[PDB]
Design a protein around this ligand. Structure first.
Ligand code: CDL
Ligand code: CDL
Ligand code: PC1
Ligand code: PC1
Ligand code: UQ8
Ligand code: PEE
Ligand code: PEE
Ligand code: HEC
Ligand code: HEM
Ligand code: HEM
Lengths: 327, 32, 84, 295, 59, 426
């Protein structure tokens, strides 16, 4: 049997309903980045429509019980959100796909530090429950803001998609487990998956996808299309950013301090074509240097190296010192 | 997106409510 | 006395009921391999229980070992009584 | 989770709204030596209960499951019990399982090894002789509302009169503790009915109390074995409480001792590469992943 | 909390940009014997002899 | 059978001995030990139950008399019967607490599958064994249980034929039915031990005390360090249960669900239908039957509960696709403007408040369903208890729907925050 040309395909999947199958250039499975999909979906859900209005009304509760809750729990243990959002506990513990990716690409430190940070706390927690991390550890935990953590999260997810998840092709499958149990034995994978039935060929064009307009809109200002070239727009943006900073204590600034809007405006102007002398030369130089350093990839200097061991056999496994003229 | 998978999801959500409707009707009938 | 331990221990400096260091501490072993460098800035230890958790009886260790064996024997004896 | 008392169901247990169930257990506290803390059966009480059951009861009721020699170590001795039970007779028709052991072809005096059978050969004979209603078998009777109190209440609760709308048929009597409050048993206990061997005054409450104690003595989970099992539970609970500290020492303090570790991370900047991390590692379930996942 | 992800392009196990503390900061050991933490009952020499006897006769 | 790739661990005696003498256990707490308590109790059931095998003659007309006479003449027989009866209850308690603990930890991931299914199957078998045991009591409760089981079995065949006769001969407890059910009960009870051993071997692959991954590499040795702690925790839980039972179950009680067990089949032909109630562990199933008067729908509800409990890893957990699976949606498609949704990732446990709320609602609903008997004399005639209905609906929804256990908003809001923070800090 051919799944295409089946009765349902012949009747419903027809040009009249625009349900016809269109064959185009061959393309990879998983053609849509998950991170981009989540960004666009988040923009559509929060910054558009009645759903956006509702999710904006509930923002205080979400910040209180999701962001601040997680942050407080992490700080109690001397950890940051990076310790949970960058690599899920499951991925660090047992997941084999993450293990292979880390072994092939990642440096040992990237995961070693993640594990040791939890080891610190848990060595004491198992011995005595209710451990509260002292202030000296808590300070260094709070030093890192959320901007760098989200930078790392986006980098890691994009890398994983582009390298590995972009080089996969799932197939119809039976129970991977070798259990003799009939319940597990007859598990059938391949049906009830939307991807399996939407496209029967790797040539078929992708019918559903975010429009370029939606992507461009999602790439816009997260705080709702404020005019940074006007006084009223700047005031609205400043109040929005201030309330955001208050809501998220350790996202972009420490709770005590306040956000510096002049530097942000200088950054945005330098990024775009707009420029002028209204910005102090010192501010412009500092902004440019910080922008250069932020994206700079750290590199090893090849200095302060320790001696490489060159072991030799012990004395008792070597011939004795004395040696004369044999013959 | 597939028609039958979407229908399967709808019936999964709805069938519990259908059973609740049947239970309520049975209670009304038993009341007399 | 029997209850003097609780009274004496009440005077302790501990963070929220946990005996932890008041500042970062780093320990190095002078007998480490040559290829090891200086200690990494990472604070591996939050607590110094290795030194704190000590009864300074390096001499007379076998007596403490016998005490531990006796406690284990009491526990096993109770369990074996139930099994009997 | 919260239940209602005015409904008539104890603790939310429905099905007993047509009789009194909380008389002496929940809304009242009738003292029974057996169920008291560190309590035990009163030998005199069970003796009197057997005396009553052998002179008024038994002629209608019986315990097919039980036998007289249950009373050997608490209430009666062997010779005394044999003398008491020799006054009854069992036909071979009584035997639930006659087997080849019982080789009698006529009546004979009972022995302490005989099961407690009523004078009737079967349930139907008892129904015929008792107006079509069968005197319930007291064996396993513990499973009635109020437990041991049940026998005591019905034996005593005959003084009340029916309300309007309830009709008591001829041959039936009103007893609020029975199912639907209509019972075919005429009031049996009357003062002076039984002359005790120990001289105890014979009044219907005392006779009911003795009979209830005896009837409870014959049960399996409750009765002659319950008090010793309660003492055993107390002893085992004491043992567990006393073993808890040693469990603590052996498990939790021990784990805390094992966790007293020192860690030290150094800077190893020798030319050696970390090949083992890059090319290494094994997974037990690799056979379950090979050819199935991530490809 | 440390910083950006570093991939296997860094050959050395310890990248140069990490910080190594000087020898001044590392705490020094107390290479002296300290008083034994022992209770009154076990400090009794008779109890110590009993422990030794149990060790070397039954244990 | 080329489709079968083998077995995880060979159960040879020497290999088992070596595996258990070398096994190590990470530091844990009491909550993560219920599984052991589930096994040890079974290890007693095989013993105590065996002692009951030598006592019970499968003839229905002699089981009560034989039990009563063996209580007196024989010693420890009633003690072992009590031990067996209470072991069933303790085993149910331990198994359900273990199930709740493993549900709370989100153990549906692919690396958990072998651990999960291998466990659930055992649980399923356990249920069957329990059923058989009840029938051996030859009380009116056993009669009702057998009748209900036979009716459910016959519902499959639409009432045509007598396909139930080979085991439920006449749908009544007679010599044939009792003998067959007793022997099957013994056989399956002993098979439960092997199933539990297989599950225990499989689960060690990814056994953890808590969801959060402690970076501890050292571990205890199972034989004495972990075994002693497990035995002590079992002792502690037994003490707690005894303390609870002392207050909750005074021996002289006005009413109890056990009174319905008074009637013995054959001796008493009259069944008190007004007061019908099973043991608490099978209470929720009869409550569901009374709540849903429809036979087919009730049978489907029971089957769905058990099987969906079995297939949790497939429905909810991650698979070959690293969270790139396309879940179907009903309403959020309009809001997001997408027909499907990528499966959310940040489904943590300890720091996730939504997961805790949903899980504790589910657990409370289960407890409420097990709380009481609907009393179907007029339960439906009167407006039925809405709490039982709502709890059953939520039990069904929680087991089968990924939005309760893997909500989308958890990651959507986090991504919103990430985008805002990165935009502010570039
Ligand atoms: C229309 C009718 C409908 C009827 C419905 C009701 C009845 C249904 C069941 C019928 C019988 C089939 C049972 C299949 C297994 C259980 C069910 C299941 O899905 O498996 C769960 C479970 C899933 O395992 P898993 O999770 O994949 O774990 C890895 C595997 O176990 C990998 O395992 P392994 O490769 O390591 O092999 C293990 C094997 C090691 O093998 C050997 O060393 C020798 C094997 C050959 C033995 C040759 C002698 C045969 C006679 C003695 C048999 C003794 C063992 C028990 C065999 C099972 C049946 C009694 O055994 C052991 O290591 C020791 C076993 C423990 C001892 C005690 C067992 C008592 C069993 C009593 C209950 C039986 C099941 C009833 C289920 C009812 C429904 C819930 O499977 C088992 O537990 C397998 C047990 C061993 C089976 C051996 C081969 C059996 C061959 C059967 C052929 C067909 C017979 C048809 C007639 C039957 C008449 C009664
Ligand atoms: C006084 C107190 C009384 C309390 C009573 C108890 C019951 C009430 C609720 C109790 C508390 C909640 C318990 C359950 C939820 C626990 C939390 C949880 O899991 O939340 C996470 C979960 C997150 O879902 P997700 O991860 O976004 O879902 C992923 C996908 O979307 C996948 O999901 P999806 O998109 O497919 O949709 C998921 C969900 C819907 O959830 C969503 O909305 C999804 C999105 C949630 C995120 C946030 C969205 C925010 C914007 C939504 C706006 C919606 C419009 C409402 C606008 C309100 C403001 C104007 O839909 C369902 O699963 C059920 C749909 C069933 C359809 C039935 C159609 C049957 C038709 C055929 C019938 C045939 C038989 C009859 C025939 C008759 C013929 C005559 O959210 C929910 O469960 C939503 C509920 C939130 C908490 C409850 C809020 C209150 C709602 C009820 C108010 C009642 C007031 C009564 C007043 C009475 C005065 C007298
Ligand atoms: C459990 C009872 C087992 C009874 C076994 C009796 C044998 C029955 C078959 C007789 C011969 C007739 C064969 C007809 C053709 C079949 C072809 C086919 O489908 O091939 C299958 C294929 C054939 O094997 P193959 O694929 O290796 O074949 C290779 C090709 N040959 C054979 C030529 C070398 O294998 C299977 O898929 C086997 C499926 C077995 C399923 C068993 C399910 C039993 C369920 C019991 C109850 C479970 C209860 C669980 C607990 C519940 C608790 C509440
Ligand atoms: C100021 C005052 C301070 C003092 C406060 C003291 C408070 C102490 C609180 C202690 C804990 C209390 C326990 C709360 C929970 C009680 C639950 C309950 O009612 O249990 C009664 C029973 C007690 O037995 P019982 O037989 O007495 O039942 C209650 C009896 N009546 C009805 C008369 C009230 O609890 C148990 O024994 C059960 C324990 C294990 C339960 C495990 C979960 C099973 C869930 C199965 C779900 C199946 C679903 C599938 C069905 C198919 C279709 C979907
Ligand atoms: C991997 O993760 C896992 C765990 O960790 C969490 C588990 O805990 C578990 C749970 C583990 C279990 C249930 C196993 C624990 C089992 C328990 C408690 C019950 C069984 C315990 C035993 C010790 C069985 C012993 C069996 C026997 C036959 C030996 C009997 C015992 C004793 C002391 C007697 C030994 C001596 C003799 C037999 C000989 C006596 C006679 C003579 C010397 C005389 C001989 C001479 C003549 C002439 C006769 C599993 C399965 C798991 O997978
Ligand atoms: C012993 C046997 C007893 C009798 C068993 C009878 C089984 C009857 C099964 C009836 C199934 C009815 C639904 C079938 C729908 C098929 C539809 C189909 O193939 O059309 C394609 C269409 C997709 O196209 P679109 O995405 O809409 O187009 C995109 C355009 N851009 O497919 C779907 O959507 C279907 C998705 C769900 C499929 C579900 C299949 C379930 C099969 C279960 C197993 C059946 C086994 C039967 C034999 C059992 C023997 C023991
Ligand atoms: C509350 C329910 C439980 C909770 C469910 C929650 C999740 C729901 C998810 C979606 C499930 C969708 C299921 C849709 C169909 C469900 C059908 C069902 O359950 O049965 C109901 C419905 C009607 O039931 P009634 O009792 O009449 O109810 C009153 C009606 N006024 O039942 C049916 O009609 C089902 C009929 C199925 C017949 C199939 C054919 C059987 C033929 C004989 C087979 C013999 C096989 C023999 C094999 C031998 C091998 C050797
Ligand atoms: C024949 C005159 C009897 C004598 C002597 C005793 N009882 Fe009886 N009893 C008898 C009958 C016919 C019935 C059945 C009544 C009915 O409506 O079914 C009973 C019943 C009881 C009961 C209740 C049984 C039940 O299942 O609830 C009890 C508790 C009871 N009888 C006790 C009892 C006692 C203590 C007696 C000696 C004092 C006694 N009965 C004598 C007939 C006869
Ligand atoms: C008779 C029934 C059962 C027995 C005897 C049993 C036994 C055990 C034992 C001894 C353990 C190891 C100790 C521990 O629990 O920490 C364990 C772990 C486990 N069991 Fe069970 N169990 C049973 C039911 C179940 C059920 C119902 C499930 C799931 C629904 C399950 C899944 C698991 C899982 C997931 C683990 C831990 C694996 C992990 O953390 O990844 N088991 N079980
Ligand atoms: C996990 C294993 C087992 C479980 C869950 C189990 C369950 C049960 C249950 C629920 C009952 C009746 C409960 C009650 O009376 O209130 C029972 C009774 C009984 N069990 Fe088991 N059982 C198990 C193992 C065994 C084994 C292995 C045997 C025999 C080898 C056995 C023999 C019996 C007997 C004979 C009875 C009835 C005793 C009597 O009526 O006097 N059981 N069991």
């Amino acid at each position: 049997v051919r799944l295409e040309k089946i009765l349902w395909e012949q009747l419903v999947n027809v040009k009249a309903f625009s349900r016809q199958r269109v064959i185009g250039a061959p393309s990879k499975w998983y053609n849509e980045n998950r991170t981009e999909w989540f960004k666009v979906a988040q923009h559509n859900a929060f910054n558009t429509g009645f759903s956006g209005v509702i999710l904006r009304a509930l923002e205080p509760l979400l910040a209180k019980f999701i962001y601040r809750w997680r942050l407080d729990i992490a700080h109690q243990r001397g950890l940051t959100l990076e310790d949970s959002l960058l690599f899920m506990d499951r991925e660090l513990r047992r997941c084999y796909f993450f293990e292979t990716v880390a072994r092939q690409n990642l440096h040992p430190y990237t995961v070693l530090f993640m594990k040791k940070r939890r080891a610190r706390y848990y060595k004491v927690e198992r011995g005595l429950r209710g451990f509260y991390v002292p202030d000296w550890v808590r300070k260094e935990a709070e030093e890192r803001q959320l901007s760098e953590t989200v930078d790392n999260i986006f980098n890691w997810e994009n890398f994983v998609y582009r390298e590995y998840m972009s080089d996969m092709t799932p197939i119809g499958r039976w129970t991977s487990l070798s259990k003799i149990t009939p319940l597990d034995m007859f598990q059938y994978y391949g049906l009830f998956r939307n991807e399996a039935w939407d496209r029967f060929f790797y040539n078929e064009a992708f019918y559903e996808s975010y429009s370029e307009k939606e992507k461009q809109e999602a790439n816009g200002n997260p705080f709702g299309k404020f005019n940074l070239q006007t006084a009223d727009g700047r005031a609205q943006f400043e109040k929005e950013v201030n309330t955001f900073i208050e809501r998220y204590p350790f996202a972009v600034t420490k709770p005590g301090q306040k956000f510096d809007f002049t530097r942000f405006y200088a950054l945005e102007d330098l990024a775009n074509k707009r420029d002028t002398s209204k910005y102090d030369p010192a501010l412009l130089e500092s902004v440019k240097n910080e922008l250069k350093q932020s994206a700079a990839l750290p590199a090893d200097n090849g200095a302060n190296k320790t001696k490489k061991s060159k072991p030799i056999l012990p004395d008792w496994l070597q011939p004795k010192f004395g040696k004369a003229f044999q013959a | 997106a597939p028609v039958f998978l979407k229908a399967l999801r709808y019936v999964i959500y709805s069938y519990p409510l259908y059973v609740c409707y049947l239970i309520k009707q049975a209670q009304i009938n038993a009341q007399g | 006395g029997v209850l003097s331990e609780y009274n004496q221990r009440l005077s302790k400096k501990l963070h929220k009921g946990h005996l932890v260091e008041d500042k970062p501490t780093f320990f190095v072993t002078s007998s480490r391999p040559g290829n090891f460098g200086d200690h990494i800035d990472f604070k591996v230890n939050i607590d110094n229980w290795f030194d704190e958790n000590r009864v300074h009886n390096e001499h007379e260790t076998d007596i403490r070992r016998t005490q531990i064996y006796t406690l284990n024997a009491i526990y096993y004896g109770g369990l074996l009584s139930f099994a009997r | 989770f919260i239940y209602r008392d005015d409904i008539g169901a104890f603790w939310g247990i429905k099905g007993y709204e047509e009789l009194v169930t909380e008389v002496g257990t929940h809304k009242g506290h009738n003292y029974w030596p057996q169920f008291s803390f560190l309590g035990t059966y009163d030998s005199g009480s069970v003796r009197r209960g057997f005396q009553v059951f052998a002179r008024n009861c038994g002629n209608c009721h019986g315990m097919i499951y039980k036998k007289y020699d249950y009373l050997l170590d608490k209430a009666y001795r062997q010779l005394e019990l044999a003398q008491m039970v020799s006054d009854f007779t069992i036909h071979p028709a009584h035997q639930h399982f006659k087997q080849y052991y019982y080789q009698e072809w006529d009546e004979r005096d009972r022995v302490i090894c005989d099961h407690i059978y009523p004078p009737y050969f079967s349930q139907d004979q008892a129904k015929n002789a008792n107006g079509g209603v069968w005197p319930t078998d007291f064996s396993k009777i513990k499973l009635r509302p109020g437990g041991i109190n049940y026998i005591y209440n019905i034996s005593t609760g005959y003084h009340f009169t029916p309300p309007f709308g309830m009709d008591v048929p001829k041959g039936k009597y009103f007893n609020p503790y029975f199912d639907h409050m209509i019972i075919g048993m005429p009031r049996q206990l009357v003062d002076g009915l039984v002359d005790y061997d120990d001289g105890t005054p014979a009044s219907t409450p005392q006779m009911a109390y003795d009979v209830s104690n005896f009837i409870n003595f014959m049960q399996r989970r409750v009765g002659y074995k319950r008090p010793d099992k309660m003492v055993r539970y107390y002893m085992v609970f004491t043992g567990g409480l006393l073993i808890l500290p040693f469990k603590y020492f052996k498990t939790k303090a021990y784990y805390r001792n094992l966790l007293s570790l020192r860690w030290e991370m150094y800077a190893v900047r020798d030319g050696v590469y970390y090949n083992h991390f890059k090319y290494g590692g094994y997974n037990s379930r690799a056979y379950q992943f090979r050819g199935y996942f991530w490809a | 909390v440390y910083g950006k992800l570093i991939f296997n392009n860094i050959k050395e196990y310890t990248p140069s940009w990490i910080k190594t503390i000087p020898y001044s900061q590392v705490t020094k050991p107390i290479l002296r014997k300290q008083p034994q933490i022992v209770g009154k009952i076990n400090a009794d020499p008779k109890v110590k002899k009993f422990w030794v006897f149990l060790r070397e006769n039954v244990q | 059978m080329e489709w079968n790739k083998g077995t995880y661990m060979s159960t040879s005696i020497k290999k088992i001995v070596q595996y258990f003498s070398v096994m190590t256990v990470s530091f844990h707490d009491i909550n993560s030990l219920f599984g052991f308590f589930t096994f040890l109790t079974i290890a007693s059931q095989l013993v105590s139950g065996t002692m009951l095998a030598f006592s019970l003659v499968p003839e229905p007309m002699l089981i009560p008399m034989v039990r009563e006479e063996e209580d007196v003449e024989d010693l420890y027989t009633d003690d072992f019967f009590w031990l067996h009866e209470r072991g069933v209850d303790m085993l149910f308690i331990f198994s359900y607490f273990h199930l709740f603990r493993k549900i709370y930890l989100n153990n549906f991931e692919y690396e958990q599958e072998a651990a999960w299914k291998s466990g659930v199957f055992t649980f399923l078998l356990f249920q069957v064994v329990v059923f058989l045991g009840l029938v051996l009591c030859c009380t009116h409760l056993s009669d009702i249980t057998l009748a209900i089981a036979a009716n459910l079995y016959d519902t499959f065949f639409a009432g045509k034929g007598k396909f139930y006769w080979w085991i439920f001969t006449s749908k009544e407890l007679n010599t044939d039915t009792i003998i067959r059910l007793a022997y099957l009960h013994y056989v399956l009870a002993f098979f439960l031990a092997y199933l539990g051993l297989i599950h225990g071997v499989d689960m060690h692959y990814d056994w953890k005390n808590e969801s959060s991954m402690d970076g501890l590499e050292t571990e205890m040795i199972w034989f004495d360090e972990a075994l002693s702690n497990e035995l002590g925790a079992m002792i502690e839980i037994i003490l707690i249960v005894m303390i609870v039972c002392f207050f909750m179950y005074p021996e002289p009680e006005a009413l109890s669900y056990e009174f319905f067990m008074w009637g013995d089949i054959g001796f008493i032909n009259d069944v008190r239908f007004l007061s019908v109630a099973p043991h608490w562990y099978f209470r929720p199933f009869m409550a569901w039957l009374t709540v849903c008067p429809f036979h087919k729908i009730g049978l489907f509800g029971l089957i769905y509960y058990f099987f969906i409990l079995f297939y949790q890893p497939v429905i909810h957990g991650t698979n070959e696709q690293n969270n790139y699976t396309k879940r179907n949606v009903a309403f959020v498609s309009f809001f997001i403007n997408r027909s499907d949704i990528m499966t959310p990732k940040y489904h943590s446990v300890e720091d996730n408040l939504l997961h805790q709320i949903t899980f504790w609602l589910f657990l409370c609903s289960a407890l409420y369903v097990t709380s009481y008997l609907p009393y179907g004399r007029f339960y439906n005639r009167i407006n039925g208890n809405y709490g039982t209905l709502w709890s059953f609906m939520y039990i069904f929804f929680y087991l089968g729907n990924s939005f309760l256990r893997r909500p989308l908003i958890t990651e959507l809001y986090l991504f919103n925050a990430f985008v805002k923070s990165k935009f502010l800090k570039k």
